[PDB]
């Protein structure tokens, strides 16, 4: 984001007419902008939704299993404390 | 009851004040209904034309007390003026007095850090702490009045509490111990010790040892030299033995710069004291 702000500062500089630019680097900035994917792609949005559901339900598995083991160890701790 | 709240909405201001007094007697039981209508009671406290503003403030402060908002309860209790009696043995009054003393001590502590911002202490809060200190002095609870006076940073009420005490030497020895154990600030500890030296000099039988110990904590060799010179010039053999005992007790504390400065400021007994 700071790099974008610096490019914006340099663009304002070019507007005022102080510093020009090497064709290659301005080319590169335009290239970055050109390769910008459309974040509003609808089928791609469902793609996000599907991966999110799958990964988070895997994490749900992991949380369930940790619940199992942690509760087991808490009960064993109660055993060791009473004995 | 929504009947008393309805009477507050009527233009008979006196009848609205009567409804407010009816809700006051009932504040302990009806606070959950009255809490919804606080803005109406606040508007009656803000209204300059209303002669019974202090009663509106007292109902608001009781409602905030039951809500658990002690800071707003205190602000409105300070608004109630003469209707907030420190004499009343109510759980409401005790909790608000404790909170009033804590806030007052906190504000006084901050005002002494910021030499540049005189935190405007509400004169009403000071007047409640005064009445409470006076109550503690009238009840013969001098040790509590001294503790509160030290927390409140009020040297004048500390002097008043000591001078009224039936056991002046016990109160002073307690003050010295409290000043060393609880007073973390050096500047304030020195101010308390300078007050104690002044109080000790007003007593008919000055304990010259406790004075010399306090003066040694203050690094004031001038005052000790003047006390030793007064005792040395006395015709009584007892005052001369007391001057020698003070000299031994000063030497046991091993403050060499203080002892040399006391010696050099002294204008057979004098040769013995110099030894």
């Amino acid at each position: 984001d700071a790099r974008l702000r610096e490019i914006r500062s340099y663009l304002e500089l070019v507007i005022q007419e102080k510093l020009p630019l090497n064709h290659e680097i301005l080319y590169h900035l335009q290239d970055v902008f050109n390769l910008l994917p459309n974040l509003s792609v609808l089928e791609l949005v469902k793609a996000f939704a599907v991966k999110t559901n799958d990964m988070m339900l895997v994490i749900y598995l992991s949380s369930l299993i940790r619940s199992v083991i942690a509760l087991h160890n808490l009960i064993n701790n109660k055993m060791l404390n009473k004995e | 009851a929504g009947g008393m709240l309805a009477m507050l909405s009527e233009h008979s201001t006196s009848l609205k004040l009567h409804a407010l007094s009816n809700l006051n007697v009932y504040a302990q039981f009806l606070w959950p209904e009255i809490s919804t209508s606080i803005p109406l009671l606040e508007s009656l406290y803000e209204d300059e034309e209303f002669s019974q503003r202090p009663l509106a403030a007292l109902v608001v402060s009781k409602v905030f007390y039951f809500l658990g908002e002690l800071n707003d309860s205190l602000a409105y209790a300070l608004g109630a003026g003469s209707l907030f009696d420190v004499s009343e043995d109510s759980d409401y009054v005790r909790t608000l007095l404790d909170k009033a003393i804590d806030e007052y001590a906190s504000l006084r502590n901050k005002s002494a850090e910021s030499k540049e911002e005189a935190v405007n202490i509400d004169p009403r809060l000071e007047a409640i702490v005064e009445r409470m200190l006076e109550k503690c002095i009238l009840d013969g609870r001098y040790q509590q009045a001294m503790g509160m006076a030290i927390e409140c940073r009020r040297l004048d009420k500390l002097e008043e509490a000591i001078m009224r005490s039936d056991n002046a030497p016990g109160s002073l020895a307690y003050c010295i111990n409290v000043s060393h154990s609880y007073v973390n600030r050096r500047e304030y500890r020195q101010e308390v010790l300078r007050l104690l030296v002044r109080v000790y000099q007003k007593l008919p039988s000055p304990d010259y040892l406790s004075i010399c110990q306090c003066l040694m904590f203050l690094d004031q060799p001038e005052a000790v030299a003047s006390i030793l010179e007064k005792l040395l010039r006395a015709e009584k053999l007892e005052d001369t033995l007391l001057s020698f005992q003070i000299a031994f007790d000063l030497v046991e504390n091993e403050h060499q710069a203080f002892l040399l400065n006391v010696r050099d400021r002294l204008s057979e007994r004098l040769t013995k004291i110099k030894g």
Binding site: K46, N53, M56, I59, L74 | -
Partner: protein
Amino acid sequence: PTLKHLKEIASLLETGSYTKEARRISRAIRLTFAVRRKLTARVLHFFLDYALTPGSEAHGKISAFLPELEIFCYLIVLLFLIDQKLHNEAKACASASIARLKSLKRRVADVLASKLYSFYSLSYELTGDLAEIRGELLTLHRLTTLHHDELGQETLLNLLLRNYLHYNLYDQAEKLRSKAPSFGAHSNQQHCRHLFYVGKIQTIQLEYTDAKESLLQAARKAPIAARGFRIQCNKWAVIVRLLLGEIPERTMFMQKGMEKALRPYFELTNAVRIGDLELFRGVTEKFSSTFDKDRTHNLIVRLRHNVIRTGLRNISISYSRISLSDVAKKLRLDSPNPVADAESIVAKAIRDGAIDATLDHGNGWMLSKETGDIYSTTEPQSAFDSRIAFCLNMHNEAVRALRYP
């Protein structure tokens, strides 16, 4: 052996007082309750003489109705008075016992007093005088709140919930909840009532989402022996679940011993599950008297609205398209104009979004949006779960935060 058990309980209480172990007093109270059914007036007076010196003003006052020890004698006698149905004497003995409680300034009296608070009011309900206590117990909570008595702080608040709920001061019952500080779960039963009393109010005030948890929260902790409290915890959880749109599972309706309690509740869901209101009226009318006993009848009226929805849930998903007249007919509305009402019923249903459907009133035909294959279950699937897993990571850490190793 009853007198021997009384003496052993008194010795246990004395030991707990000397050792300052409130668990000791808890075991003593458990034993005292274990001797409730064998309470004899002669044996009780013998215990009074043994623990109370003959001539004690407390001893004389206790005998007239027939610190820790003086209070404790009031504990059994008050219980026996209600045991003998002498609620009027328990009322005075309750005030007489508490009146002593104010004078005593010892922390060890919290458990003894806390039990008294439970029994102090109990005489009033049996006497019908819960309204005369709001000026009595509340300051008693004030003293417990003033003394930092956590056990008394909770027990007295729930009774505040009970008293205001029993008098239907529900505009005021929530008033308590916003103000009462959350005291630690020091009491397993009392907090359940605090957890559950919020469950009743949450059911009453439409905060159903919060309602289910606290309804489950107390039921999560409800004792097996307190089946009625479990049932009461289980009777209220049923209403919200039906009020939540989620029918409670049949399995809760086969828990041993509580089945007779939920019999009216199971059939109510089935009609909701079937989505027909006619049997609702028959089931509601026959058990309307039983429902009056629970006072949740007001919760009952709302159910038809969801039951209307529940019938709606069947029709829209199990039928692609059917005219609005068919909509009300299968709903069996006794409405003089089922054409407009069902048409209107769908309007609210369409507005509520309960159905993926569209109306065609020009043709009078309703179009349930193809609600079979549809699209991704996601965005809400992947939002629903995270609340649950995120609950575990705290809850797993809840075990982790409780992990001593």
